[PDB]
Amino acid sequence: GKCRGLRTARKLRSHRRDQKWHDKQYKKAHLGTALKANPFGGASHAKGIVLEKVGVEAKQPNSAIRKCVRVQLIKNGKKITAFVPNDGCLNFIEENDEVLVAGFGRKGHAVGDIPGVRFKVVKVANVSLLALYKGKKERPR
Amino acid sequence: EWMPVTKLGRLVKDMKIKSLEEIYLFSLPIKESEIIDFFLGASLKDEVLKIMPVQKQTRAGQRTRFKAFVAIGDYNGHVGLGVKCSKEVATAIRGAIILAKLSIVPVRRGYWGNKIGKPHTVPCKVTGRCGSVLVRLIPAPRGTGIVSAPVPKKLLMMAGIDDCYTSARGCTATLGNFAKATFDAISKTYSYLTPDLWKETVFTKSPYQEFTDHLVKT
Amino acid sequence: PVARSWVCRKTYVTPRRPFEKSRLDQELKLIGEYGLRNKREVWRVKFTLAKIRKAARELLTLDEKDPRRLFEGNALLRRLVRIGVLDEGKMKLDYILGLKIEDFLERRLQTQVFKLGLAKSIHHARVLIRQRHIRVRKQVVNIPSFIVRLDSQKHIDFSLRSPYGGGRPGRVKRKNAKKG
Amino acid sequence: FSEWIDDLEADPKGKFAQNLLKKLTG
Amino acid sequence: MQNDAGEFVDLYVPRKCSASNRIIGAKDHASIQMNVAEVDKVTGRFNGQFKTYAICGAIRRMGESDDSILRLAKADGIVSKN
Amino acid sequence: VRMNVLADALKSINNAEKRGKRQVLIRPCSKVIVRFLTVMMKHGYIGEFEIIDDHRAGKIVVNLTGRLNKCGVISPRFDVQLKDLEKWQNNLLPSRQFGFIVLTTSAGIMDHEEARRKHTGGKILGFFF
RNA sequence: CUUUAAAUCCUUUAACGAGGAUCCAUUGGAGGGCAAGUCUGGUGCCAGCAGCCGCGGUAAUUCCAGCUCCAAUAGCGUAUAUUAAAGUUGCUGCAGUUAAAAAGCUCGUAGUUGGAUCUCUCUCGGCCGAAGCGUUUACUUUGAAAAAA
């Protein structure tokens, strides 16, 4: 059982701080290896240059092709696969144009049937993908 | 109408049980829901807490039945919870309503601070358990409302509890066990010995004795 | 370094569960009964009542013969009585916990100027207040949320520059009369 | 109420399962 | 069970076991309310009056209901001392 | 070994009352145990008790009424200040209407209501209700 | 030209200023969680939706649109960080037979914990400051001192 003594505060605190390192979120947030391995470097968004378009096959129970783009982040020069969200939005994207890319919503975890894709394209050529999708704005000439 | 089949039912129908609290006082079991219908009448409001399809695997396929969890009770101190499983949803709900009527228990209401006006909360902290679901009810200040999950909130509101504090532990995602644990905690209110109940009991005649002449004379 | 002041405060709190029929129906009942613009006004009145209840509970924890409890509870009860939400007969900390949201929404200038017959309906009361037709004492009040005190209840008049209590015709009446 | 019961008990676990159970009493 | 005005606010006052002085719940169907008939000192007849003992189901299950009722009947003259 | 004999006394009383027994034998006796039992008995929870004197460490035969829901010790004996007593009774007591916390204070061993009346904080021994 | 060191600003008075009061409210959703359509048309495991479970393989309540509806509202969506939720770090307050877990076993110092027991000492005027080794304490509860925002 746990020690219940008036002078056990050091033991209790040391045990708590040692056991916290067995917690997934605490270790990933404080050990530091997760931040280094983060392509964004701890940011929320990142600007990259689209290296190419690519289609990934969805996970087995449901079948489709997800139109992702391989980009290279400007800040750290890493290579990322970012899912272009909607339909026809890959047409809005060309090769070697800067795209603002955010997370997929699961904090580095892959989202849905898409395998190993944890990023989505937010803006292309300095204009949002939503505006292009809704026809509010056009691609700059 | 309704022909009673029990001595208690006959006494209740023959206008000679003053209140439902006599049966609760003598712990007699209710076997006909018409007693509750007669005593609480139109004050009882029922609702279906849950319909759950449960399947038994067979050689030909899966025999699917529906289990209805239904709460009931006038919003003045009496609550009941009933679970009935049958081949059809309507029959299950009817059976659950009948069973919840049969299982009505009196709810004791108490005070958080000063004893002004009608009691509003639970008399004390009370815990109910139903297979790893632990539900704890704590007295709350007047006007707090029922700080609880939706299922315990509905059960406590039907119990007539004006306001309460709730703690839950376990797999409360199983609505049946959550409801049964809340019902257990609510029913444990009148079974808790508080200092104001220390006064020695003055035993009164049981209804099977104080109207035994009416029963025999038939 | 600036001479400014950044002491601000959010006056409402968002419900923990975004969607539930009971709360939504209760809040819409309040909106319809008192003619409010959105749910945030209901949440604001709820937050005010919750702060009052929390202070009352904190005082109620204290000993009855505690100078802080006496002073601050007396001040809070006096303030509640003054704005007309608490009866002078029941002036105790235990009666604060019996206060409801409606007791506070009832004291708004919208509600009071609808209850005084100065407006036909509560929404007419709001559009009257927003259009500067209503005054409290000698001051033209323009905010419907104005919590009318007890000593200003019988002073909600119909302004003096407004055609309803003054007599100068408005833009529409003047423009229509010039075409006679 | 009856139509919801019929839809639920036709396919108690199909596509129209959660919605019908929720619509029953909620 | 009394509010500060002195008014009783309970639905009912539940019975307490005559042995352990613990409340007998509304659904404790194993509880008994025994009536033991009183008897005159010289003729040995039922007087129409009786003494009542309520025993909860917990003791009845444990098997100490017999000793409990025996002690209750000894503590009231119905059973001869020793 | 046997440390904190007050814990053993209170546990024995609690177990004997759970079993519905009319009398419980507590051993060894102690000054703190006797004071705690007296505080219990003033509030009608425990009834009369008798200290058997053997020449080494007394025992106590405690009569029992079914009035005790739970009697418990708090280990270690935390030093509770009068401003922090409300939190302790919120944690330990079933309601504000009944239930007592026993504090050992410079003025003796007494419930939390007496400790608040006498404006004395101390070390929490246990609770009963 | 009130305001202010010329001054745009609220405030004030005045001239125009509203009946698709065109002086046109948006953002996100409508299977469950979670509020709100198994209505219509298109697509046919494609395009896509979907935080999760899951929709889509020609009668899709879930995609693309129309209509309708609900949620907040001059505000709504999204992405990371973080708090509560989390009694999933547990001092309050977790768990360790079988779900993750008791060291193979026993000695052992530090650590933590520890049985009963104790109720002309002293000065001006036949109730006062001084003066205290009461065996030092941890304590409780007062009293000064603990910036302002």
Enumerate the residues of chain F whose CB falls inside 8 A of the CB of residue A5: 76
How far is E50 from B15, CA to CA, in rounded Å? Answer: 27
**CA-to-CA dists, residue E7 to B115, B117, B195, C175, E11, angstroms:** 10, 9, 17, 71, 12
Which nucleotide lies nearest residue A15, CA to C1'?
Answer: G89
**CA-to-CA dists, residue C76 to B12, C11, C72, angstroms:** 53, 19, 6
Are residues B21 and B65 part of one domain? Answer: yes
Which nucleotide lies nearest residue A112, CA to C1'?
Answer: G50
Q: Which CATH number goes with the domain that contains F100?
A: 3.30.1490.10
Domain end position, chosen among B68, B91, B106: B106
Q: Kindly determine whether residue E22 and residue F65, on different chains, have CB atoms separated by under 8 Å.
A: no
Are residues B66 and B26 part of one domain? Answer: yes
Taking a C-beta distance cutoff of 8 angstroms, is the pair B162, B142 a contact? Answer: yes
How many domains does chain A divide into?
1
Q: Kindly determine whether residue B196 and residue E54, on different chains, have CB atoms separated by under 8 Å.
A: no
DSSP letter at E25 equals P
Q: Which residues pair with B50 in a beta bridge?
A: B69
Among chain E residues, CA nearest to B203: E52
Burial class, B136, CB count within 10 angstroms (exposed 0-12 / middle 13-18 / buried 19+): middle
Taking a C-beta distance cutoff of 8 angstroms, is the pair A28, A34 a contact? Answer: yes
On whether residue B213 sits in a domain, the answer given is no
Domain span including residue B99? 1-106
Taking a C-beta distance cutoff of 8 angstroms, is the pair B86, B66 a contact? Answer: yes
* Identity of residue B169: R
Are residues B161 and B115 part of one domain? Answer: yes
Are residues F73 and F20 part of one domain? Answer: no
Enumerate the residues of chain B whose CB falls inside 8 A of the CB of residue F94: 124-125, 192
Are residues F64 and F5 part of one domain? Answer: yes
What dihedral do alpha carbons B126, B128, B133, B134 form, nearest 10°?
A: 20
B95 phi-psi bin (left φ>0, alpha ψ -120 to 50, beta other): alpha
**CA-wise closest residue to A93 among A65, A116, A121:** A121
How many domains does chain E divide into?
1
- H/E run at residue B137: strand B133-138
Are residues B4 and B58 part of one domain? Answer: yes
Q: Which residues pair with B78 in a beta bridge?
A: B106
How many domains does chain B divide into?
2
Q: Which nucleotides of G are covered by protein (CB under 7 A)?
A: 13-14, 16-19, 28, 31-36, 38, 45-57, 61-64, 70-74, 78-82, 87-96, 102, 111-118, 139-142, 149
Range list of β-strands (E), chain E: 32-39, 46-55
Are residues B164 and B66 part of one domain? Answer: no
How far is F75 from A1, CA to CA, in rounded Å? Answer: 14
How far is B203 from C68, CA to CA, in rounded Å? Answer: 50
Are residues B120 and B96 part of one domain? Answer: no
CB-based touch A/F (3+ pairs, under 8 A): yes
Considering only the beta carbons, identify the residue of D8, D13, D25 that sits closest to B48.
D25
Distance F129 CA to G42 C1' (A): 73
Question: What token pair was written down for B97?
Answer: 């309503």
How far is B206 from E33, CA to CA, in rounded Å? Answer: 8
* Identity of residue F84: D
Are residues F62 and F122 part of one domain? Answer: no
- Helices D2-10/B89-102 angle, 10° precision: 110
What radius of gyration do chain A's Cα atoms show? 21
Are residues F120 and F101 part of one domain? Answer: yes
Domain span including residue E17? 1-82
Enumerate the residues of chain E whose CB falls inside 8 A of the CB of residue F67: 21
Chains in contact with B via at least 3 Cβ–Cβ pairs below 8 Å: C, D, E, F
Domain span including residue A116? 1-141
What radius of gyration do chain B's Cα atoms show? 19
How far is C84 from F8, CA to CA, in rounded Å? Answer: 58
Are residues F74 and F63 part of one domain? Answer: no
How far is A89 from F47, CA to CA, in rounded Å? Answer: 83
Q: Are strands F59-63 and F23-26 parallel, antiparallel or unpaired?
A: antiparallel
Torsion sign, CA atoms C117, C121, C124, C130? positive
How far is B147 from A1, CA to CA, in rounded Å? Answer: 33
- Tell me if chain F has a CB within 8 Å of the CB of E54: no
Domain end position, chosen among B44, B73, B106: B106
Q: Kindly determine whether residue E26 and residue B196, on different chains, have CB atoms separated by under 8 Å.
A: no
For A29, other C-beta atoms within 10 Å of its C-beta total 11
How far is E54 from E33, CA to CA, in rounded Å? Answer: 4
On whether residue B208 sits in a domain, the answer given is no
Distance between F99 CA and the closest CA of chain E, angstroms: 16
For F16, phi then psi, to 5°, come to: -65, -35
* Identity of residue C51: K
Mutation pick from B136, B193, B196 vs chain F, by most beta carbons of F within 10 Å, is: B193
Q: Which CATH number goes with the domain that contains B111?
A: 3.30.230.10
- Tell me if chain B has a CB within 8 Å of the CB of E31: yes
Question: What token pair was written down for B200?
Answer: 């020695």
Q: Within 13 Å, how many C-alpha atoms sit on residue B215's CB side?
A: 17
Q: Kindly determine whether residue C60 and residue B113, on different chains, have CB atoms separated by under 8 Å.
A: yes
Adjacency order of strands within the sheet including F59-63: F23-26, F59-63, F49-52
Are residues F116 and F73 part of one domain? Answer: yes
Enumerate the residues of chain F whose CB falls inside 8 A of the CB of residue B198: 44, 67
For E41, phi then psi, to 5°, come to: -75, -20
Q: Which CATH number goes with the domain that contains B34?
A: 3.30.160.20
On whether residue B126 sits in a domain, the answer given is yes
Domain span including residue F49? 1-68
Among chain F residues, CA nearest to B197: F67
Measured between alpha carbons, how far apart are the two ends of chain D, in Å? 12
Distance B178 CA to G88 C1' (A): 20
On whether residue B183 sits in a domain, the answer given is yes
Are residues B119 and B96 part of one domain? Answer: no
- Tell me if chain B has a CB within 8 Å of the CB of E26: yes
Are residues F98 and F63 part of one domain? Answer: no
Distance between B123 CA and the closest CA of chain F, angstroms: 7
| Residue F36 DSSP SS3 | helix
Experimental method: cryo-EM
Distance F74 CA to G95 C1' (A): 22
Are residues F7 and F63 part of one domain? Answer: yes
Q: Kindly determine whether residue B106 and residue E52, on different chains, have CB atoms separated by under 8 Å.
A: no
Distance C54 CA to G72 C1' (A): 27
Domain end position, chosen among B106, B140, B169: B106
Query: Tokens 């009722």 belong to which residue?
Result: E69
Distance F7 CA to G97 C1' (A): 29
Are residues B130 and B114 part of one domain? Answer: yes
Q: Is the peptide bond before B139 cis (omega within 30 degrees of 0)?
A: no
Range list of β-strands (E), chain B: 47-57, 62-72, 78-86, 105-106, 126-130, 133-138, 146-147, 164-169
How many domains does chain F divide into?
2
